[PDB]
Design a protein around this ligand. Structure first.
Ligand SMILES: [Mg+2]
Ligand SMILES: [Mg+2]
Ligand SMILES: [Mg+2]
Ligand SMILES: [Mg+2]
Ligand SMILES: [Mg+2]
Ligand SMILES: [Mg+2]
Ligand SMILES: [Mg+2]
Ligand SMILES: [Mg+2]
Ligand SMILES: [Mg+2]
Ligand SMILES: [Mg+2]
Ligand SMILES: [Mg+2]
Ligand SMILES: [Mg+2]
Ligand SMILES: [Mg+2]
Ligand SMILES: [Mg+2]
Ligand SMILES: [Mg+2]
Ligand SMILES: [Mg+2]
Ligand SMILES: [Mg+2]
Ligand SMILES: [Mg+2]
Ligand SMILES: [Mg+2]
Ligand SMILES: [Mg+2]
Ligand SMILES: [Mg+2]
Ligand SMILES: [Mg+2]
Ligand SMILES: [Mg+2]
Ligand SMILES: [Mg+2]
Ligand SMILES: [Mg+2]
Ligand SMILES: [Mg+2]
Ligand SMILES: [Mg+2]
Ligand SMILES: [Mg+2]
Ligand SMILES: [Mg+2]
Ligand SMILES: [Mg+2]
Ligand SMILES: [Mg+2]
Ligand SMILES: [Mg+2]
Ligand SMILES: [Mg+2]
Ligand SMILES: [Mg+2]
Ligand SMILES: [Mg+2]
Ligand SMILES: [Mg+2]
Ligand SMILES: [Mg+2]
Ligand SMILES: [Mg+2]
Ligand SMILES: [Mg+2]
Ligand SMILES: [Mg+2]
Ligand SMILES: [Mg+2]
Ligand SMILES: [Mg+2]
Ligand SMILES: [Mg+2]
Ligand SMILES: [Mg+2]
Ligand SMILES: [Mg+2]
Ligand SMILES: [Mg+2]
Ligand SMILES: [Mg+2]
Ligand SMILES: [Mg+2]
Ligand SMILES: [Mg+2]
Ligand SMILES: [Mg+2]
Ligand SMILES: [Mg+2]
Ligand SMILES: [Mg+2]
Ligand SMILES: [Mg+2]
Ligand SMILES: [Zn+2]
Ligand SMILES: [Zn+2]
Lengths: 49, 91, 245, 104
RNA sequence: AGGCGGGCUUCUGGCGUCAAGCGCCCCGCGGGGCGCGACCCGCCCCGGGGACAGCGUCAGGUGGGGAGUUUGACUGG
RNA sequence: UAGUGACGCGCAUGAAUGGAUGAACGAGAUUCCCACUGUCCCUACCUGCUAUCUAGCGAAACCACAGCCAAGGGAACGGGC
RNA sequence: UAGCAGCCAGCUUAGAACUGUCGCGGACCAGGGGAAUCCGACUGUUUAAUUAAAACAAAGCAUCGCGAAGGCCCUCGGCGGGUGUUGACGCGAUGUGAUUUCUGCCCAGUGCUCUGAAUGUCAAAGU
RNA sequence: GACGCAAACGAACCCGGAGAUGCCGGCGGGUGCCCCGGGAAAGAGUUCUCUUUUCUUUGUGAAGGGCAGGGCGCCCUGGAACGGGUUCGCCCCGAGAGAGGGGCCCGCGCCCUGGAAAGCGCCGCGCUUCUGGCGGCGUCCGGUGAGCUCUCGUCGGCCCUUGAAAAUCCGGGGGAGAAGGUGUAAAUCUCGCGCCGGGCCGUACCCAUAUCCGCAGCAGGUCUCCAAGGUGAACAGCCUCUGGCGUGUUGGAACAAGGCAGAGUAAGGGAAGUCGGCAAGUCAGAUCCGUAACUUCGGGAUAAGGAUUGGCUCUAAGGGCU
RNA sequence: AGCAGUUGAACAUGGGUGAGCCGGUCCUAAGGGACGGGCCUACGCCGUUCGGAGGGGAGGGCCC
RNA sequence: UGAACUAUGCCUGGGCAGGGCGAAGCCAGGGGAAACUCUGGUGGAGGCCCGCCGCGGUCCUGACGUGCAAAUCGGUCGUCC
């Protein structure tokens, strides 16, 4: 909600920075071995609790 | 003037609770809501505040009396009995 | 089976007393040198209604004899007292209504209330509304007295037990018949969670030893022995007799 | 006619979430949160039902910033006892102390 | 744990707070201290029970409140 | 064969395992009457959304092989002989 | 002086004439009624997802335990905890189920309870 | 005198007040909204005919000063029966009314400081990424209402229901103490003003026929605030303005059977249908009349059974102010 | 995103929440839960204003 | 290991149009020899009545029944100081 605690807001900040797409240069570095981040979550499909 | 022949104050209950029960609450709801003469001022403003509590709206005297009446018949005979036992206790 | 409703009342989860808005414990003043060799003067400040009982309480304000302070005592409002009067507690107190004098210095046939079982417990017997205890006889030899409790049982107590003269206020409260189940709802809503009593015959055999059966019969003698285990001791516990009487 | 809304997070009609309508210089009608009404002091006698006079009726902590003259009267028991019960305490104290001279 | 054992408040919905007084002593007309006032002595704070309640452990009775289990077979179903 | 009022040797009614009665009350069970109506005599017509057709999109239960009948025999009622 | 003059202000009620095709709460909103029987007095509650009832509750009535070293009950346990901030007009345990009118006979059986070491049966310990 | 003055020493200790009291009903004061009257001002709409017409806009914050208004078992004088005062209801008076003169409290209303410089409305000029700026005028005069809400008061009603604690703040009692010796000192509840400081955390958005839960953009579920015009008793139903939306996971062409729904309609008969008036049909608002058996005398009861109802033009009655 | 899409709560790249006086913070309500003590073979549990030599602020120059 | 659903209790908050019958109390006018009566008005009582939101879920044994939904939808219906 709008009323958050510092620990909850610090927990939502990390999950927001983990949900970023894989960098483009990582794909060429690994030779298309890691093409997409296998931990991408959607705010409608997956809930973090 | 008179709008109810028999019920009186218990007409608020309608046809519920029976006849004999509504007859017993009538004699009590009258004495419970009636305002009595204040023994300390003479004004008839001793109305019941709570169960066993009787308060005056003029001298602010609160008297601990009966539940539905000002003074129960048991307490009047006791007060006269204690006054008789006190006199014989001295002499 | 499971435990009966009577067994669950000893745990004290939802069957505890509802003592949120209660004004305190109604008890006499603790016995001190003033109440042993004389009397102490007290003024009745207010007569309040204690949520949960049918007898009012009086806030008598005494004067502390050892420090400059005024103690407030929450007595049982004897029927007849009023705000602004003086209450004298002690041995030398006169035989008036409201005073707290020991039973040893009262004539036979006195009407007392808030009587003490043992010297110091600050008033236990004859404390409900409209009830009283009569002093039957004394005994200066054994320093004991004989009083008649409102249950009709004559109890032999010490002659040093203090008591308030006069009957308790709120008498005749049980004379007005409750008409609605709502008035009984609010009656017990301030006391405890005990009002709706489901009969044992209306239950199943798992919850009560009277439940079950294609009819609502009890099926067993309702008169139960006293040494019966908790769970079976329902109905008429150790009934000496039954009938209309 | 405009339908105005609350101005704080509390969206319930509690005892502290009380508002009133005020017309702003911008020709608008917005809520204006008011403080709870105060009460004038009562007499220490516990008899007179009316409140005391000559004393402000504000909140408790508002009395910290008020001056002393705005919180009492120039009488003996001013600010804590009404005038009618003071003159009765003077007569009761004098007449009781006089009966205690007759006994000697 | 506020006066126990032994040789001063009843006319009123006031007031009561570390002692006035007296005696004695110590310092620089200004301070301080002690005793009486506020009796003396003592073994438990004051009351109510008291070797009885109660506790520990065996023994007998009671005990569907609760636990475990059982409630044969043949058979024109 | 229902309902109601009576009759009572009542398989097996009955007195706080409560008997009898009962104004008011009931989304409780039942009978008759007035009014009313497609419930029926006896069905017909109109309208909206579907079914239908079409562009796009597009499942599931189920499935030994499968799918025309009569009689016969048979595990005493076949689809197959 | 059986009060009048000036000015201002709304919203209702009653009666009458006329009039349209006897239509007018014109849409909308919006109780079918009566005579009886059975059960429960009533309001309330109930099987979330087949049973809303005649079942449960209920006020009233009646019985039963207990004066606190107590009645009822909880905890492995503290002589800890609940009723109890309580004290018989109270708390705990049951049956009946408002009011009206009544509530008969049976204590042999089962159960409860009282009497008692004044007589049988009768453990451990002790003799 | 109630009590008023810008301040107006004061400990321990004590006492009291505020914080801090339910639900319901009646009434009154004030705002907001709505409505009415200006043959008001500024734009817009309508004009085939009529319409001095229709629609929109016409403002003031907190804090302080002043004054209306409301409340008061607050004071003084005085004294009451031929009792009087008074409310919608009540209630009040020798424990002292009525009347006269005062005091205090609440003032969220009005005027002023703020404050018109700003905000809206209209008009003109300059300008097209400094341009995206400068000027003019206006912001007015009243009315009430069984109107609706909110709020502050006040009088009651109900309870075998009496409807919270604490932080914190204040007043009084108390007179222990401190202050200087002839002009000041002690002390000041800012007492007029000045000086410095106020850290940490949350703050976006959705809040539900697509941002929550139910596997989903699920006809379910999920706590509240604001809330207009007309008809009407209504926050009912139907229609409209502000605001929002494209008909709720799709378009097109047909109008067969059979379904779901519109609680569609119907000749004559009117429950003969069916386990059973299931289904839906009649009745329905309001006014004026008229209402039995039975009953616990409260009820039954909107019993049952009749009449009236539009539109238009009038008449009569019910007010306030000077 | 159950048709489509030039659209999106999709995908990608950037940006966005500023307080002495809004709320948390502060208070205790129900209630939770230490301390003393008791209990449990024990991990621990019972109990909550009662119970311990439980007082570490205020004043007079060392008193209380 | 769970009382984010539900059952009961406690603390602290919030909410419940518009109408109807109309009880005690009070005022006035009539009847009386007193006991006390009658009419109108006032007043606004109630686990009172019609009824919106709310809260419930009767009937159609309607719709739906590989549904919008692992319990929902429509009319009707109970209650609403
Ligand atoms: Mg989700
Ligand atoms: Mg059963
Ligand atoms: Mg049984
Ligand atoms: Mg039965
Ligand atoms: Mg049998
Ligand atoms: Mg509201
Ligand atoms: Mg078994
Ligand atoms: Mg088994
Ligand atoms: Mg066998
Ligand atoms: Mg064989
Ligand atoms: Mg027939
Ligand atoms: Mg028959
Ligand atoms: Mg028989
Ligand atoms: Mg029998
Ligand atoms: Mg029978
Ligand atoms: Mg009804
Ligand atoms: Mg029913
Ligand atoms: Mg019926
Ligand atoms: Mg019902
Ligand atoms: Mg086959
Ligand atoms: Mg019969
Ligand atoms: Mg029948
Ligand atoms: Mg019923
Ligand atoms: Mg069910
Ligand atoms: Mg019985
Ligand atoms: Mg029954
Ligand atoms: Mg019998
Ligand atoms: Mg027997
Ligand atoms: Mg509060
Ligand atoms: Mg409160
Ligand atoms: Mg009011
Ligand atoms: Mg006067
Ligand atoms: Mg002072
Ligand atoms: Mg926001
Ligand atoms: Mg959608
Ligand atoms: Mg068709
Ligand atoms: Mg059809
Ligand atoms: Mg027809
Ligand atoms: Mg037939
Ligand atoms: Mg037939
Ligand atoms: Mg039907
Ligand atoms: Mg009838
Ligand atoms: Mg698509
Ligand atoms: Mg985008
Ligand atoms: Mg994204
Ligand atoms: Mg409430
Ligand atoms: Mg009715
Ligand atoms: Mg409803
Ligand atoms: Mg509903
Ligand atoms: Mg339910
Ligand atoms: Mg439904
Ligand atoms: Mg169905
Ligand atoms: Mg189907
Ligand atoms: Zn009086
Ligand atoms: Zn006073």
């Amino acid at each position: 909600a709008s009323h958050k605690t510092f620990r909850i807001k610090r927990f939502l900040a990390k999950k927001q920075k983990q949900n970023r797409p894989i960098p483009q240069w990582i794909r060429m570095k690994t030779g298309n071995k890691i093409r997409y981040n296998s931990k991408r979550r959607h705010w409608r499909r997956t809930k973090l609790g | 003037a008179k709008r109810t022949k028999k019920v009186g104050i218990v007409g608020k209950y309608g046809t519920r609770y029976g006849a004999s029960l509504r007859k017993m609450v009538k004699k009590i709801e009258i004495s419970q809501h009636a305002k009595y003469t204040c023994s300390f001022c003479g004004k008839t403003k001793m109305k019941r505040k709570a169960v066993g509590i009787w308060h005056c709206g003029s001298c602010m005297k609160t008297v601990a009396g009966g539940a539905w009446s000002y003074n129960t018949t048991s307490a009047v005979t006791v007060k006269s009995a204690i006054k008789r036992l006190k006199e014989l206790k001295d002499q | 089976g499971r435990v009966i409703r009577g067994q669950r009342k000893g745990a004290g989860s939802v069957f505890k007393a509802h003592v949120k808005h209660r004004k305190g414990a109604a008890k006499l003043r603790h016995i001190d040198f003033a109440e042993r060799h004389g009397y102490i003067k007290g003024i009745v400040k207010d007569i309040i209604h204690d949520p949960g009982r049918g007898a009012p309480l009086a806030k008598v304000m005494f004067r502390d004899p050892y420090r400059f302070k005024k103690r407030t005592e929450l007595f049982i409002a004897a029927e007849g007292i009023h705000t602004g009067q003086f209450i004298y507690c002690g041995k030398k107190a006169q035989l008036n209504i409201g005073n707290v004098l020991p039973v040893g210095t009262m004539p036979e046939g006195t009407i007392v209330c808030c009587l003490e079982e043992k010297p110091g417990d600050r008033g236990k017997l004859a404390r409900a509304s409209g009830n009283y205890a009569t002093v039957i006889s004394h005994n200066p030899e054994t320093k004991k007295s004989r009083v008649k409790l409102p249950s009709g049982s004559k109890k032999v107590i010490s002659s040093a037990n203090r008591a308030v003269v006069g009957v308790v206020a709120g008498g005749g409260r049980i004379d007005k018949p409750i008409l609605k189940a709502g008035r009984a709802y609010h009656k017990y809503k301030a006391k405890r969670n005990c009002w709706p009593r489901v009969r044992g015959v209306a239950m199943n055999p798992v919850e009560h030893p009277f439940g079950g059966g294609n009819h609502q019969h009890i099926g067993k003698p309702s008169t139960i022995r006293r040494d019966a285990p908790a769970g079976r001791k329902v109905g008429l516990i150790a009934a000496r007799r039954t009938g209309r009487l | 006619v405009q339908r105005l809304t609350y101005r704080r997070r509390l969206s319930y009609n509690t005892a502290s979430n009380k508002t009133r309508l005020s017309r702003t210089p911008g020709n608008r009608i917005v809520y204006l949160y008011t403080k709870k009404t105060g009460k004038s002091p009562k007499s220490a006698c516990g008899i007179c039902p009316g409140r005391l006079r000559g004393i402000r009726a504000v909140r408790p902590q508002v009395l910290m910033r008020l001056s002393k003259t705005k919180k009492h009267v120039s009488r003996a028991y001013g600010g804590s006892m009404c005038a009618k019960c003071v003159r009765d305490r003077i007569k009761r104290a004098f007449l009781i102390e006089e009966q205690k001279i007759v006994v000697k």
